[PDB]
Write a protein that binds this ligand. Structure first.
Ligand SMILES: *C(=O)CCCCCCCCCCCCC
Ligand SMILES: *C(=O)CCCCCCCCCCCCC
Ligand SMILES: *C(=O)CCCCCCCCCCCCC
Ligand SMILES: *C(=O)CCCCCCCCCCCCC
Lengths: 122, 121, 41, 41, 41, 122, 41
């Protein structure tokens, strides 16, 4: 599966047009397919590495686990009601929009932090 | 030709453009043989999922959403020119790109002191 | 911009829409899909 | 190189360290992470 | 082309073989395997 | 009371000699008299204030409670065995040397962080 | 001034805010914290 996760509107069974993106105040949960976790893990992995320099210099804030930006919702996940109907996923791992924001600006803020030290080490 | 025809992409802070005008404007420019004039909100619905610039007004509060939810949710988040460091998608490639060459042509061994087949060049 | 109604969840001339780029979300689709021999399998 | 002690599992001036490149393990972190539109999703 | 027999499931000079390109299946093994630092891990 | 905390090294009977600065793997616990908590609280208070800017910019690491650098030891606390004998304090709040180091370099690291923003706000 | 929403209990462009100095409350954070040797302990 891929795309944002969808649950139906009226309730009961979900028939196309009965399914709308499960928008939440935080944002819409978009599914985190297996490979897309490889990236955000590979990105965070390269930051955790600099753990000994984050404590030394009192910056950072502990190791960044990718499991802090996701969730364990479940529903049908596709690109559109029609095709999302063929991807019933249970307790999949989705990252809400407002989260897709932090995992972003965190990896960005930390990326600066290390990008600097990482330059001296070099 | 209609979307980029109003640069829906900035890279620092935000910037709006009252929708009425915008529309009533492209109602002009767009040449009579597009397909965005024959299906406005049949293209618009496709569009909303590609341009987190166009945020459709929610039906039951008749106001935007702050957040923009385009299908490319993540990808589009990771391309924004993050102010901390230029752009991850850029700086990332400019590196893997260089790494390719470094191993490829054989820049390594550039001043090797020993016979090398011209082919190696 | 003539009203449609259901074909798609949003009207274009619909109530309170809003063009407004944010340096934060660079619009997007999927162009660089990898298909090269080794990488597609 | 002043002794530290616990901050990190290794002292730099620590006992029996050893700089010694091996053609076998070319030192490398993670630069080429793929993020392009199509490939990140 | 001398007959072999079992080494491999097909004889070359075997009965009814057939060279015949199809614009449909462009012959290709696996050259572009990704191994760059960030992408291999 | 004031000064580093001492404890009867000879056990039980605490005389003007059976004491000894209770040092250890963390350094020496120095007592945190009422007023000296006013400062470190007044210093941390001025940093917590900038909470909304720490999250926004993914720096920081949560609000700094002064109760994270101290402890609740108990013994006699003075400047010297002789005079420390007249300050039996129970479950007083002491900050160990290695801690007096962080509450220091934290307030220092954070102080930079805010000193900057705090300049733009101005 | 673009709407935020929860990050902080107040929107800047929020409804009915109000810049209005009062000779009564001279705005001030904490600069003169005492740390000198004798006074900090
Ligand atoms: C009715 O069709 C009047 C014209 C208004 C929209 C036509 C196309 C121009 C705007 C495009 C909206 C969808 C993405 C650009
Ligand atoms: C004490 O700091 C004396 C200096 C010895 C090391 C300083 C930095 C030079 C060696 C780098 C070691 C870590 C990776 C290069
Ligand atoms: C016996 O070996 C006679 C020669 C016939 C085949 C020899 C090689 C030329 C044809 C190649 C077949 C395998 C892929 C080209
Ligand atoms: C959106 O950011 C539009 C600009 C309005 C406020 C920007 C900063 C100027 C006002 C400062 C408010 C906070 C304390 C001065």
């Amino acid at each position: 599966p891929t795309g944002k996760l969808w649950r139906p509107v009226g309730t009961s069974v979900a028939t196309i047009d009965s399914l709308a993106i499960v928008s939440d105040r935080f944002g819409q949960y978009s599914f985190v397919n297996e490979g897309m976790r490889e990236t955000f893990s590979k990105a965070l992995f390269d930051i955790n590495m600099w753990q000994p320099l984050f404590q030394a210099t009192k910056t950072g804030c502990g190791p960044i686990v990718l499991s802090s930006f996701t969730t364990t919702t479940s529903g049908y996940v596709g690109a559109t009601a029609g095709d999302a109907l063929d991807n019933p996923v249970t307790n999949g791992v989705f990252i809400s929009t407002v989260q897709i924001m932090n995992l972003q600006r965190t990896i960005a803020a930390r990326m600066r932090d290390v990008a600097l030290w990482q330059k001296h080490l070099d | 030709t209609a979307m980029t025809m109003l640069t829906p992409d900035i890279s620092a802070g935000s910037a709006s453009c009252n929708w009425k005008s915008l529309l009533a404007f492209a109602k002009d420019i767009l040449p009579l043989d597009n397909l965005c004039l024959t299906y406005p909100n049949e293209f618009y619905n496709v569009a909303i999922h590609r341009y987190p610039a166009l945020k459709p007004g929610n039906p039951d509060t008749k106001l935007p959403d702050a957040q923009a939810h385009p299908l490319g949710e993540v990808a589009g988040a990771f391309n924004a020119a993050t102010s901390e460091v230029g752009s991850l998608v850029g700086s990332s490639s400019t590196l893997s790109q260089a790494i390719s060459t470094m191993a490829g042509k054989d820049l390594d061994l550039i001043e090797a002191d020993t016979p090398l087949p011209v082919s190696v060049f | 911009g003539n009203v449609q109604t259901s074909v798609n969840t949003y009207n274009i001339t619909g109530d309170g829409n809003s063009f407004t780029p944010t340096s934060d979300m660079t619009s997007t689709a999927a162009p660089a899909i990898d298909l090269k021999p080794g990488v597609l399998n």
